[PDB]
Amino acid sequence: KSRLMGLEALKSHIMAAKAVANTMRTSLGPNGLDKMMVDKDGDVTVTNDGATILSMMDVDHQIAKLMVELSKSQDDEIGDGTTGVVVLAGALLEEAEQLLDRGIHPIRIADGYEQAARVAIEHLDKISDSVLVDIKDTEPLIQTAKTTLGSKVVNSCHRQMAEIAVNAVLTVADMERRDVDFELIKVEGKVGGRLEDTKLIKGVIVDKDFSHPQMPKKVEDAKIAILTCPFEPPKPKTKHKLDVTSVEDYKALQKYEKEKFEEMIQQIKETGANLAICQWGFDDEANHLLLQNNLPAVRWVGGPEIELIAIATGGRIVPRFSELTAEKLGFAGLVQEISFGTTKDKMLVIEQCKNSRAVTIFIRGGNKMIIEEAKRSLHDALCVIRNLIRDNRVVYGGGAAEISCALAVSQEADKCPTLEQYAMRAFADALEVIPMALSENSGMNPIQTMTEVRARQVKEMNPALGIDCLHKGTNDMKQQHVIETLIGKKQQISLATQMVRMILKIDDIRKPGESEE
Amino acid sequence: DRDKPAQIRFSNISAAKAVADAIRTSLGPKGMDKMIQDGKGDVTITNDGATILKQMQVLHPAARMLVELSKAQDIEAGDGTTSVVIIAGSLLDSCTKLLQKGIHPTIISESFQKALEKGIEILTDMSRPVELSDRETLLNSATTSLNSKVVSQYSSLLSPMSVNAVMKVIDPATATSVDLRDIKIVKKLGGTIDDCELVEGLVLTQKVSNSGITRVEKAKIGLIQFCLSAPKTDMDNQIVVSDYAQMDRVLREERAYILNLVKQIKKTGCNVLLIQKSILRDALSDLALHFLNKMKIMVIKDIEREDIEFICKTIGTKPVAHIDQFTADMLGSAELAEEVNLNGSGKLLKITGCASPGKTVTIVVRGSNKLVIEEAERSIHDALCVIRCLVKKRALIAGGGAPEIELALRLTEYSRTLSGMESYCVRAFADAMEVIPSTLAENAGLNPISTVTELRNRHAQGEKTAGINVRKGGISNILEELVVQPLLVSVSALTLATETVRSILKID
């Protein structure tokens, strides 16, 4: 191989980030442009999301792999904050290289950013450190999900999605725990729905429906049979399927499968559960016997999902048929197969209200994109909203804070005799590309755009107003309501600057080539 | 498109910028001499950018401007001509940046002489005014500036001679600009630098008299802008060339005419007669002059018609093409007209006292040899320049590139306070300052990026509590070691490059 160091890999570092960041900065925010990206599979994927662009790319260098993975943290953490943490991380390389080109040792410049990254997250802290609860936040949450839902250019009427994200996150991620929890959110949805059709179903909705319409379409409260028992082919880990080759071999195959399921559907109904949800669900033959014994019950369920009806419903667990008892049953508030107005999206709700241990957002859309549109819309809303539900901390974004952060540090730079003022400068100097690149996606002069806000930030001494993130002509982060969790505003910084630092401490590269992913 | 000009500009940019660095190697005396092959194919070793500009040069247009970059600063302050080249490439970098940023070269330009007006104030804010009316203050200061410079030995001796010759061309308490205009620097081959002397009427080349009085007091100074030779009808002579007989009667004509005009000279009269060269004439008949000094007029012959223009203005002997233009009118009245052959070699007509416009000051340069003569010539001129630096621009400032370290950080924030899309411009504008002391810090040797970072704080703190201090070449108060410069060398350096860049920015 070759050890590639000095400007050699320093290029291989500064090289990869630029191709990466730019499609992201051209896709940056709502003004960010929607990029069709087609696989080697020949499949169009339109990506205005840097993370989705990151999900779409893997660019060859180890950092370009990690940058895809970098946003995923804040994408998991904060939701929104995916694109900005990367696009600026490459701008530091621009900054830093010139700074090394200024002769400033790489570890010197490497350190000053993080060194100046304090005020970066620290100046943010001063904007809104506020905290509110669910019914309070729901207005800031929809106000933030004005931006976050609209970050996918779908917020319209979707305060429905915001408001169901309000009560979704607090349920799963408590304001007091201050621990990230999306796990008990049950992501659910189906193609063919609407953006305007979206639901938060506090219980679990199973795809399967009643085995017959002749059997009632309502199972009463509770009394659900949670079981692993075969009513169709069992499908274990490994067994080979042999069929019947004879006339005398065919007849008895029908009798036995009738004889056991009756007793089983009996015993289940005799166990006293009026919905049998079986980890191995019903064949079409078990359905009529279920109708013979006249019990409402569910067909094939995913293996762990029968646990998902054990956890979410508060029903104490019976693993299998052999153990059937009336004490441990599945619970449901109300069992209904529900059509939302698009029968293309049709679910049987196992309804949870009193004990709901998995909250279920149900998202809808006409196409695979449109759900995913609403999905990544609300999910990134969901996380910022989660961030805001724990502590409702916002800032006036889109570079209005980046300028105001660029004041202190670049100022504070020269306050210090230390070499890192140049870094601190270039630190505070690297901040402002976001409104710049935004104004470019916003289709305006990016250069005055930043300074328009600093002219404000002179006057303002605070982000409130800003430039146009929505291209709607009102220059605001305030009445335009560019409002996002100040947490995730600080998450981009620490992730961007400290990753680049770790990228910067390594100019030492053993690869067969220069940039190897 | 103007891209092709931008390319051109970038190419001009490409040319001019690498050129400015070559002087950045020579920036300061701590900056290093540069060996130069010429058409002679021989080495030329100078720390002097101005010559390195001139001496071997490319006539590339961007390079063509950069000689006048210094050559202005050459004629502006007489000094600081390295810096004005060292200020060049600093913005030339930043200007391409803005160009690379896509900033419009007008806007680039437009942002600068604007912000230049800002910087000079803060620059002047750093500055300390000295007393231009006081001869000794300047005699202390420009000396200290000479002490801030290399040339001392004669400059020490020649500081009083400079400052006095200056103080003699200082009428004003402002001391105006102290034009070197009124100064005539004369050299005499004999003598020593001690025999360099300030003379209050013009020391004139040689003297020329046949029977003419050796030294005439109260001298009416004539000038001949008229031809003393009889008109030339054949070669030089009023004769025509055919035979011996017909010409001798018009040989008689060449006779009387050259004498009469000569007679007419002393008949309207002069005690001294300025005579330019006879090549600076059509022709001047010597048989006339043979009779003209025979009229016992003190005379000089063969003087520069340009020095005449100096003589005309300084001692008030005005251009005379006519006997009528002799009365006393265009004739300077020279109290003592004599040539001094003394102190070794050389003879120079020395006007001692005169009727003269302004205070006419000529300085003799005598030296142990020609080279000794040559060496004190800058000595005065150096002093004379840092004088005409500081008398012209009153406020004194210390040298050592510190004010740049001081001004950058401020103009960066002033840029920010100015804000606007032009902030980045004025930012990059402000960002061209440290570059000069930066290379200078290497020129003394340092890491400026390490060192200038700190003075920048020092110059954030006291605005100057320290500065790159030439002997130290590093952080310390430059006012403490007294490395000092008039604002003129600074200020005169600013507008040129910026403007010249402001030029090349609009220039296609």
- Assembly status: part of a larger assembly
Query: Structural class of chain B, please?
Result: alpha+beta
The number of distinct helices of chain A, counting runs of at least 4 residues, comes to 16
Report the sheet-strand fraction of chain B: 5-15%
**Gross morphology of chain B:** elongated
Number of helices of chain B: 19
Shape of chain A: elongated
Measure the end-to-end span of chain A.
15 Å
Gyration radius of chain A, in Å: 28 Å
Question: Order of strands side by side in the largest beta sheet of chain B?
Answer: 6-11-10-7-8-9
The biggest beta sheet of chain B reads: 6 strands, mixed
Query: Portion of residues in helices of chain B?
Result: 40-55%
Residues in β-strands, percent of chain A: 5-15%
Subcellular location (chain B): Cytoplasm; Melanosome; Cytoplasm, Cytoskeleton, Microtubule organizing center, Centrosome; Cytoplasm, Cytoskeleton, Cilium basal body
EC number (chain B): 3.6.1.-
Protein name (chain B): T-complex protein 1 subunit delta
Main location (chain B): cytoplasm
What does this structure look like?
- This is part of a larger assembly, with chains A (517 residues) and B (508 residues).
- With 517 residues, chain A is mainly alpha-helical.
- Chain A is 48% helix and 11% strand.
- In chain A, a hairpin with a 5-residue loop joins β2 (35-38) and β3.
- In chain A, α5 crosses α12.
- The longest helix of chain A is centred in the middle third of the chain and has 25 residues, at 247-271.
- The radius of gyration of chain A is 28 Å and the shape is elongated.
- The two termini of chain A are 15 Å apart.
- Chain B is an alpha+beta fold and 508 residues long.
- Chain B has helices spanning 3-26, 49-54, 61-76, 81-86, 88-100, 105-110, 112-126, 135-147, 153-169, 245-268, 286-292, 305-314, 370-390, 402-418, 421-430, 435-444, 448-461, 478-481, 487-506; strands at residues 34-35, 45-46, 128-129, 183-188, 197-199, 203-205, 216-224, 272-275, 298-299, 332-340, 348-352, 361-366, 395-398, 484-486.
- In chain B, the strands form 4 sheets. Chain B has a 6-stranded mixed sheet, with no helix packed on it. A 3-stranded antiparallel sheet of chain B has the order 3-13-14, with helices on both faces. In chain B, strands 4-12-5 form a 3-stranded mixed sheet.
- In chain B, α11 links the parallel β8 (272-275) and β9 (298-299).
- The longest helix of chain B is centred in the first third of the chain and has 24 residues, at 3-26.
- Chain B is elongated, with a radius of gyration of 28 Å.
- The chains are: A mainly alpha (517), B alpha+beta (508).
- It is classed as chaperone.
- The entry lists the keywords TRiC/CCT, PFD, CryoEM, Molecular Chaperone, Protein folding, chaperone.
- The entry is titled "hTRiC-hPFD Class4".
- Chain A is T-complex protein 1 subunit epsilon.
